[PDB]
A paper describes a structure:
[name] (GS; EC 6.3.1.2) is a vital enzyme in the nitrogen metabolism of all living systems. Consistent with the diversity of metabolic roles, GS exists in plants as a number of isoenzymes, located both in the cytosol (GSII-1) and in the plastids (GSII-2), that are encoded by a small gene family. MtGSII-1a is expressed in the vascular bundles of all plant organs and is highly up­regulated in the nodules, accounting for the production of over 90% of the total nodule GS activity.
The three-dimensional structure of [name] GSII-1a was determined at 2.35 Å resolution by X-ray crystallography using synchrotron radiation. The crystallographic model revealed a decameric arrangement of the enzyme with D5 symmetry, with two stacked (face-to-face) pentameric rings. The ten MtGSII-1a monomers adopt very similar conformations, as highlighted by the r.m.s.d. of 0.35–0.65 Å for 291–311 aligned Cα atoms. The extensive contacts established between the subunits that compose each ring result in a buried inter-monomer surface of approximately 3500 Å2. The overall buried inter-ring surface amounts to ∼2500 Å2, i.e. approximately 500 Å2 per individual monomer–monomer interaction, highlighting the weakness of the inter-ring contacts. Considering the contacting monomers A and F from opposed rings, hydrophobic interactions exist between the side chain of Trp141A and both Ile147F and Gly148F, as well as between Gly148A and the side chain of Trp141F. In this particular case, the structure of the apo form of the enzyme was determined and therefore there are no ligands present in any of the ten active centres. In all of the MtGSII-1a monomers a segment comprising the Thr293–Ala299 region, homologous to the Glu-binding loop of bacterial glutamine synthetases, is disordered, leaving open the entrance to the glutamate-binding site at the narrower end of the active-site cavity. There is also a concerted movement of several segments of MtGSII-1a, notably the ∼180° rotation of Ala246, with its side chain now protruding into the glutamate-binding pocket, and the ∼90° rotation of the upstream Trp243 side chain that packs against Pro248 and leads to a rearrangement of the Lys237–Asp242 segment.
Numbering used by the authors:
A (entry chain G): 1 to 277, 314 to 317, 327 to 356
B (entry chain F): 1 to 277, 314 to 317, 327 to 332, 337 to 356
C (entry chain J): 1 to 276, 327 to 332, 337 to 356
D (entry chain H): 1 to 277, 328 to 332, 337 to 356
E (entry chain E): 1 to 259, 265 to 276, 329 to 331, 338 to 356
F (entry chain A): 1 to 284, 302 to 356
The structure:
């Protein structure tokens, strides 16, 4: 409605100083984003000044015990592209009332790694490639799926233009701008090989914020698909039959690698990655993660292995 | 039709100083909000400066006895998020032409309680959690209700995002901004365990204003569902079959609780509520009733009642 | 389309000084409003400065004989809420080319009454309640009419809120603002007992202007229902079968009633009305109703 | 809905100095436009300052062997009419990682021709007429195709107006303004003989920028048909059966032609064109057409 | 489908002597008919030669789950107008495995009354008028219910003809013939005052068979509405709002009356023309023949 | 469409003496019925006089090996209710070209059991109850599934009548008459607890023919749902969520159990069944039995106890069981097996 969108787009700065904060977290599947919103007395840019919150963990498959309460710790702030003004998104990680990180909290361990002085001094930069597929809500097939099936790896959809080739660009372009506005370092987008299939890239992002941003980007994307009435999947294999997906390739570089200087340093890091069990060379790419893996794990494991691990 | 919203959204400040006041009241079922609007000469911020009004109680199940007139007393003003500008919402309570509160007027007795020096000195604060369900107008099942029916208490709807999980968010978000604009102390919202089910929280709100705000929040919400062509229910059990609803839990604290040695005041307060007969511990929580009644009963039982 | 509304909403002040004037009149059924629009060189606020106009009365059931021409006399100006800017609505009344009021022109005799020095001195104020029903275009039953039919006098529609109770509020709220914008003294609105049934109140309005304003308000409402694709009826009994309508009560006060003490003036006025602050009088033409009240209490001699 | 277009239409200048660049290239069929977008730190007006990029050529039928990587060289900048603000469109041509132009890269050779001192000194101007057909997505027949088939070369569609004659004008007018905004020298448009068939002209455009501009205009057009949910064809024969198409006629003038003009210089150019087989030369790649005329008339010696 | 109706209309007499018997009973609400079918070796006309059967009473609100078996006693036979041929309908009443009538079995007590020598010798005849309403499956409003709603008691529907007046006559005429074919003494039909509203009359019917026949006729009617995709209600008030229903009038005569009425009318008042038909019919006999003031 | 059904319903006896035989078999999932049809020179009543046939086993998940040919052995004849006249249905079991039964051929071992003199002398009768669900083709939810979802175990659908209660009776009544016409010993039908859920019973049928008849009855049902444009499921849980399904309960009696003294014989058989329980469950939790307590593994029934003779019910098999396995295992355990 036009009456409805007017209420949704009300600018609160004209009526008070209160802001709305959307607290966001990863649910019990490790892939389900959850959120809810609260009012704060005034604008906030420092996450550490945000109050902690809580939710019912037995409703998100995260607290089975007699105590269902789970605590939310604010960790990163972004501008809310939906509520606009001084309203914000808050990426949180999740803990028991006693202060223990939940098993589905991957940020905790990642934060320990990125806070290590020898990792922190190396200024690790990350570039993440996030593929996704837009799906018809009723049928669960990708937008533009051709009547008659699987089209193949050589087709008109990859970076295509036109009503018969690019399906869902409105969602994609809305997302690109929403992310820039929010403060995410989104570095690009492209239409992928399958109809309704797309990719966005994020980076360079330093350390723990790479994970914060990617989760923030996924949140915004699904909020946008929600508006459009379309289902989004980050699964590498979102439908049966043949399917061409990429994965979740991660580009990585340190202060030493970027100061050449250490062209050689890139190669030894690659040596270390091979030693642990895909990797190509500036910076280098890691080709093992799939499109739904947790970025906190992926990014921190690369730093640990290349900066802290000794066989 | 774009021609229509242009008219609805006209800025009257450009043409004169007159304002429109939407007078709101609780009807004969104790849960049905009613309203109508009048033009006033200029901007008003003090409810005591508003004229009294009236309506036909025989049309809202509030006047049987040969005299159908019921009187409206303005009690609280909020900004009107629908008409915008200087136009206002007016929460009223209802009286006979003779000056007596109607049986369905719960504000009067609640106000008497909050006006008592022993209550007023304790500065009672209230926090209310209002759960509600958004229902398809034609089928009366919740928005997004799954074909197989009751999904269970463990699902993707609670605080969910995405077309297949969150149903009716445009309404929820419209309501959130609308209340803040209106001047209600809405403190947050969340998607609940069932599809189409949500919650908003209001507070802390002082004394009689908790009820004023709650009714105002309910009014705004149902005005918004009206626009969206959706039905709203505040019933804990809004459909047959299995259902997970919470209720309307109420948080309460006094000045004594908020200061030094609240621990004792809190347990004692709980003891008296128990002695009268659902209560758990900052402050404490008390588990479709009228908020004027609920909030004032808590103050009275804990501050005025002497066993 | 959005291309269309852009053209409809052009601000003519940006391109010239010309304004558009919508001349409005009551047709041969006594309840059908008609209008058409003309271009004038510049802004006008004084009705007496508007040129007279004309139309084919044989197309509106208002001229049977060999000369079908009917003359329009501008009588009242309001701002046009549809064209916006300096464009205006013009309430006219209607005459033969020779200068005689048509039988369906009720403003003429009303004007004589309000022009009478004894009436004019009393500054009569009117408050008029206009009930109306919004009807589905195809079925001609009210918006929100329930499958089972007539619901009874006790229901959720009266001053109701919600998708299942208030039917047509967008029209009603558009009208309220449109009337205020136009310069009509609209004093309030409410949902009525039947679904799709509503009321607006106008006043206080002075003398002959009560009728001019009520007619302008009816005009504006029906232009709005036209936009919404809904039919409107001002008939107290707009559908067959059982139905609750209120009516059209008219509140009335003279200068004398409004001063000290007035109660006595009110007493006598009430007696004369029966025989033939303020007080209330229990599809009619507002020109007739209001002027008859003034005449009965100020000019008539029992 | 309206929420979606708000996000798409966000002005990024309010949040940072970063811009979005849409890299565009010709795919493996020689007629398929492809593109994707990346974030840059600040505004750029010089193509030579833009970073090179890459894509998977095995996905656009442009790299078969074990190395599917293809390099994009930015060549021309236009403002992005879709993202607005300081966002840009970037016309690119394509190379192997080793630095060799791909077979489907026609810009490379044209650029050698226009950079040649004997060509460059003559400032070749080009005027290109681009015909196209708007097709129903589901049926693949032109918009407004009549129940009964091919209407003939004599009809109401050529430069027509009205719902029954002009099909897809909203696309055409969006494109016209979009191209002007972008910085393309679009010189006019017209409805053509077949329903849903139209033409745009570009020029005068100097040298290599003629081809850059036509490709950018084709890109903008298909992005617009995409928004409209309509298919576009630049094929001279976009459906079976009889059909009236023009082609891609190219106008050409040299500095000397614009001087005296003399006409003799024109005669000479025409003569040389004949020998190999301003003035007019009657879906091909504009880089090829434009550069061959320049080569033949300025470099080629009989 | 013609392929489907060909299978449904197969004449089993052409392939064997086996027949199908549809056992019918009254469920736990007292108004819900239930049935299921079994194969028998050959034609049967004597209800007492039919085997008893059983069902899960916990699925029809007539037994608890821990002890759910309920026994079906065959009581009356009719020809089955749906399966045709030698196939039959069997009206049953219902008992615990120990042999007691279920509380929702009203036939048992009615049978005792009609078996009483003071009643049986008097040959009580019954005429029953059964009103019903045909309802649109999706809306639950009557067939032909007018857009503007409740029309009033004076209208064109009563005994009407035409597309705009008679709604559901196909169902009604099918029912009339089906009942006659089945062996029910259906004595007439008429369109009623409300749209989609109808009545059939059964009688004269002797004693306990009046109840058997009415239930059999109700069965046949709802099987027919099932075919037509229409819902049936025997409720006097089948929709909210105003409605014109008759009631449940019952005609009654004894052997003595047919040869008198006033003494019976007197007896009825303290407690000619006057819910479960077994109850209604037997209580009238009891009132006028067995009762003690 | 009447033009089409006229062709389908042609009486071939008026045009020739040739008949059409629909050879039917169980495919590689153990539940997928397959069939195809051939022309034979004249009418046939003796299955042993029908020629063998073959099919491509790599197309029904029944021959992975390099030789995809699988052989069809005719075993049972029924009249074809679809083609009518002298046209027939032929229940087959399936073998390698070399002559060995396929792993998915369960008839073979069952036949070996029913041919044993100790089983045959005993004349085992079987009664099988086949529950099934009719599903809307597009949504995969049952016919008549209510807008608000799962209704519960106490409702109006069980043996119900009316447009709002009984869903799919045309299919059910067509199937009942088609089976009778075909020569199958179908003994009854009823509407079940869930919307669109129904049951039919077959029996008493002696020995190996019980399985032949059950499979023929299943074939006919799915051929009828195909005509109706409806999907049929014999799965114990044809939809997610709560669901009330029974299974495929099997009644069993020997000549001795049916005569006087029979109850003592029944108890001994039940004892033997209990000693095996795990073997039977694995093929078809804690073994139990009684007369009217659910969910006993085995039920005797009031009538049997009362009379001192009759039969007993094995309530363990699920609705998608292979009747050859169930029927023959009951005979084997109670008549041939030595603990």
């Amino acid at each position: 409605m036009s009456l409805l969108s007017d209420l949704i787009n009300l600018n609160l700065s004209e009526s008070s100083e209160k802001i709305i904060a959307e607290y966001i977290w990863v649910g019990g599947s490790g892939m389900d984003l959850r959120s809810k919103a609260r009012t704060l007395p005034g604008p906030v840019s420092d996450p550490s000044k945000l109050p902690k919150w809580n939710y019912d963990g037995s409703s998100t498959n995260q607290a089975p015990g007699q105590d269902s309460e789970v605590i939310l710790y604010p960790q990163a702030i972004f501008k809310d592209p939906f509520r606009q003004g001084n309203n914000i998104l808050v990426i949180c990680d999740v803990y028991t009332p006693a202060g223990e990180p939940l098993p589905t909290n991957k940020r905790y361990n990642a934060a320990k790694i990125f806070s290590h002085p020898d990792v922190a001094a190396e200024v690790p930069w990350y570039g993440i490639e996030q593929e996704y597929t837009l799906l018809q809500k009723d049928t669960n097939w990708p937008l533009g799926w051709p009547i008659g099936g699987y089209p193949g790896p050589q087709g008109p959809y990859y970076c295509g233009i036109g009503a018969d080739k690019a399906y869902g660009r409105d969602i994609v372009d809305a997302h690109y701008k929403a992310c820039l506005y929010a403060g995410i370092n989104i570095s690009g987008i492209n239409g992928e090989v399958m109809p309704g299939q797309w990719e966005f890239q994020v980076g360079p992002s330093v350390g723990i914020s790479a994970g914060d941003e990617i989760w923030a980007a996924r949140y915004i994307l699904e909020r946008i698909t929600e508006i459009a009435g379309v289902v989004v999947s980050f699964d590498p294999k979102p439908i049966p039959g043949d399917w061409n997906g990429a994965g979740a390739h991660t580009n990585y570089s340190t202060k030493s690698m970027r100061e050449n200087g250490g062209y050689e340093i890139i190669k030894k890091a690659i040596e270390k990655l091979g030693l642990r069990h895909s990797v190509r060379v500036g910076y280098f790419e890691d080709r093992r993660p799939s499109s739904n893996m947790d970025p906190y794990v992926v990014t921190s494991m690369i730093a640990e292995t290349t900066l802290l691990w000794k066989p």
